[PDB]
RNA sequence: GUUUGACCUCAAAUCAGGUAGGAGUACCCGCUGAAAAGCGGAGGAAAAGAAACCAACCGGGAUUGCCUUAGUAACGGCGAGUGAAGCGGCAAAAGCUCAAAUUUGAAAUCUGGUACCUUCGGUGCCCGAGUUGUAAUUUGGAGAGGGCAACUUUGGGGCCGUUCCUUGUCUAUGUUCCUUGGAACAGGACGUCAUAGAGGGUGAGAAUCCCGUGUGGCGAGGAGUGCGGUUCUUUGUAAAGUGCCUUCGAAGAGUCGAGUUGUUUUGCAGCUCUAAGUGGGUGGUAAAUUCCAUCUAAAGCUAA
RNA sequence: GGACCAAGGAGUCUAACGUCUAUGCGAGUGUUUGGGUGUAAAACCCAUACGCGUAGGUUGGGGCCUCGCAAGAGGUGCACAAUCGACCGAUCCUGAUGUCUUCGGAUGGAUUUGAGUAAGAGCAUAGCUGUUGGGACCC
């Protein structure tokens, strides 16, 4: 999980991540200079939805570079592009473009008020946490043994409730 | 299935802090004196604020929780020492 | 048989310390109490002789089936078709008191009893508040205790 | 690799352990007086168990100490907490029938 | 007092008593380590082991091992493939000891020497060790001091059995006729034993020739407290346990942790920094200036 | 590639999926981790778990019936196939009753969809075999 918010200010959001990618693979095969400015790519509207306009917003706020960077003379053509696929918002690097940087899939969790404590103001109800998952998964199999049980039970009834008597005319049925 | 209440087995490190380790505790303190970076640190709520001495407590520190409690402790030196 | 260890050990002449084990270990002597010694039977098992006792053998839940070994006949259900003795021996045992002793006291004490017992009397709340012969101070009814064992054993 | 070739030989000896065990222990049960215990995890939780111990407060309803129950031959647990009722007097009951059936000698 | 003596330290002893090494090394435990070798250390097992645990439940309850979890989770140029764990069922089951506050109305503790004695030791005496703390009591599941009420309990030997080990000895029935053969143990006829027709030897396939085998019996010498009887003693204001009341009610720091480096796939190690006491560790939880859960780390032993 | 001759000498074993066949049981199936038992590595019995599976019409048409001496005719129709259906899930539009101003899916469409529903077939053992990997026919 994460959180990013104004200190003394009431902007507060918890976001999920999802599909981590790293700079050790081939999928990066390329370096930049650390303290470029960065640009942004909206791949979405963040207009519509007033609680993701103020995502997009604390996350100008955020991702924003002042002057102040080191190694900010260069401009390392560096740009970060986000996408509401769903409502998972793809987050990618590039440096013509060559993805060389960390790969997102995050996901918007819930949003309160204050600087951590605040009451909470916005949910998305679309979210699932894992837990959650892991719990239908242990609900289902338990679900699962109390029906083989049960059937268990109700074959051992039939067993019982399934044998057939003898004819009157047989010999064990004489003797 | 309907409930039954157990006794709380609550440690006994839990329970409180004595007379006795308080008195141990504060009798050690003012033998032992200060080590030198808490020689800085007085010295540095003094001329520069409680903000960069929570600051640099925390860097001679590992965590913020303990250079909160640190600093606290040279506020109460310095309330022990200097009025009285 | 082909370390050379074992080469020398057969060409030697000492001979193989040879011990012979794998009959006794089979059977096993109780060793414990008399009465189940005598009811031992070194045929059964642990399991069956333990239950021609009497005894619980293992406590709960045995693994795999027992032997419910035929002792009815189980006759087909139709579905409505259309027209002790040396568990007797050991609780006697059990239940035999054993020779006791009393616990008595010993002498000095007694005879420290004996002194305060004629110094004071019956009365606690004097014999309490004694220095002399009261010099370990004891407990108010501790010394009710010691007299009134003191009394019993002689004197009343 | 490792074949179990001493599959029928190792329960032969183990049956030696308990007659052997048996033997020393000749009156006593080989196995101690346990708890019965409803289990965890909701794939199980309607499965009752044996349980390690007991514990002191239920040994205590039992009307006994638990320094002299090890002597007894029940389990003792002190680490477990009886929270549930049923499984509490359930097992004092069980507590109960055990100290019925023993005849201690002196 | 330039003397004398306590100590403390450090030497020396052909002083007394002990102990280390080496071999082997299947299994075990550490260290190192390539494209295993090596090193070090033990035992009959070793290791681990009595939660700073697992969980999220109607909670479980030291460790170990088996089946299942499962080729799953997870990891991986998510390529090669790598590859768990909770729970459950079973085997086996066992729990304990320190370190913190005084015994201060008496260091109550122990090694050693010697004299005896019933010698894996005991008693006495004397040197020492030790207060810079050896005993008793207390390890959270509390516990301690008292007080009350009761109850309840006693330990140590012997001997003889038993149990265990190591042995010794005893315990059936054809060598009947014929043929063949160098040799009957072969073939035929007639038998006997059997809880003994396993096996071997004897000049060829021997239950019955021999040794054994089978069933029981009688010994002998040890081990031993496992228990079973007898027998001798053990108390001294001795030791302990349970309920109630009262007064208290102390615990693992160069550690936890933080950063970095190496190493491993998260620990470990090094370097630097370095804590708290209603504390700390760990995990879920949120209708959120959250609640709840669960253990007590930095000391130790422990059969199967 | 070879003087001759004797002996030895080269597709074995195991693991994982796969077809086929046989066998037992059957929507269930699988004793053998383990326990009990025993004449004792055999056989015999089995508690709790676990594993894997389970949870309409028309046209024909094997046959069968009727009639027909027969030939044939009529009827009921196994398996399976084709069609027209239906429904579920998806698909893209309709966007109602309500509606917290952005929630909602009601109804009606549309194509394909799917080892889909519309009345099971699997589990276990053995054998023969297919692919892969262990040195893998041998040198």
Redesign the interface.
């Known amino acids: 999980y994460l959180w990013l918010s104004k200190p003394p200010n009431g902007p507060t959001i918890k976001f999920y991540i999802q599909n981590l990618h790293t700079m050790d693979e081939x999928x990066x095969x390329x370096x930049x200079x650390x303290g470029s400015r960065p640009v942004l790519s909206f791949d979405q509207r963040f207009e519509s939805s007033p609680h993701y306009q103020l995502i997009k917003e604390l996350l100008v706020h955020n991702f924003g570079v002042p002057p102040x960077x080191x190694x900010x003379x260069x401009x390392x053509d560096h740009v970060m592009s986000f996408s509401i696929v769903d409502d998972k918002i793809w987050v990618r690097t590039y440096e013509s473009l060559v993805e060389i940087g960390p790969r997102f899939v995050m996901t918007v969790i819930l949003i309160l008020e204050g600087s951590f404590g605040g009451p909470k103001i916005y949910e998305n109800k679309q979210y699932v946490s894992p837990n959650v998952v892991r719990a239908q998964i242990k609900q289902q199999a338990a679900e699962e043994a109390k029906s083989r049980a049960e059937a268990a039970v109700e074959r051992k009834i039939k067993r019982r409730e399934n044998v057939l008597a003898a004819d009157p005319l047989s010999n064990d049925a004489l003797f | 299935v309907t409930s039954m209440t157990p006794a709380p087995k609550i440690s006994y490190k839990k329970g409180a802090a004595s007379n006795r380790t308080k008195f141990v505790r504060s009798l050690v303190r003012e033998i032992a004196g200060l080590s030198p970076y808490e020689r800085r640190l007085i010295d540095l709520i003094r001329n520069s604020g409680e903000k960069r001495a929570r600051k640099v407590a925390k860097k001679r520190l590992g965590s913020f929780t303990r250079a909160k409690a640190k600093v606290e402790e040279m506020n109460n030196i310095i309330a022990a020492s200097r009025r009285h | 048989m082909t370390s050379v260890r074992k080469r020398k050990m057969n060409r030697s002449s000492v001979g193989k310390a040879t011990r012979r084990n794998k009959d006794k270990?089979?059977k096993?002597?109780?060793?414990?109490?008399p009465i189940?010694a005598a009811n031992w039977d070194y045929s059964l098992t642990?399991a069956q002789n333990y239950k021609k006792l009497g005894?619980?053998?293992?406590?709960?839940?045995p693994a795999g089936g027992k032997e419910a070994d035929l002792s009815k006949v189980v006759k087909?259900?139709?579905?409505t078709?259309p027209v002790t003795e040396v568990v007797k021996k050991?609780?006697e045992?059990?239940?035999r008191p054993?020779i006791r002793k009393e616990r008595s006291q010993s002498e000095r004490e007694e005879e420290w009893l004996e002194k305060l017992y004629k110094k004071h009397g019956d009365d606690y709340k004097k014999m309490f508040f004694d220095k002399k012969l009261n010099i370990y101070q004891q407990s108010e009814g501790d010394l009710k205790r010691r007299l009134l064992r003191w009394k019993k054993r002689n004197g009343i | 690799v490792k074949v179990h070739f001493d599959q029928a030989g190792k329960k032969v000896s183990r049956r030696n352990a308990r007659a052997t065990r048996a033997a020393k222990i000749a009156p006593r049960p080989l196995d101690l007086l346990r708890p019965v215990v409803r289990a965890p995890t909701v794939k199980y939780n309607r499965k009752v168990r044996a349980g390690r111990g007991f514990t002191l407060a239920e040994v205590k309803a039992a009307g006994l100490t638990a320094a002299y129950a090890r002597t007894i031959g029940i389990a003792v647990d002190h680490r477990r907490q009886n929270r549930n009722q049923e499984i509490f007097d359930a097992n004092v009951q069980r507590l109960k029938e055990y100290q019925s059936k023993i005849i201690v000698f002196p």
């Open positions: 270990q089979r096993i002597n109780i060793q414990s109490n189940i642990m005894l619980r053998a293992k406590l709960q839940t087909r259900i139709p579905l078709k050991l609780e045992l059990a239940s054993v």
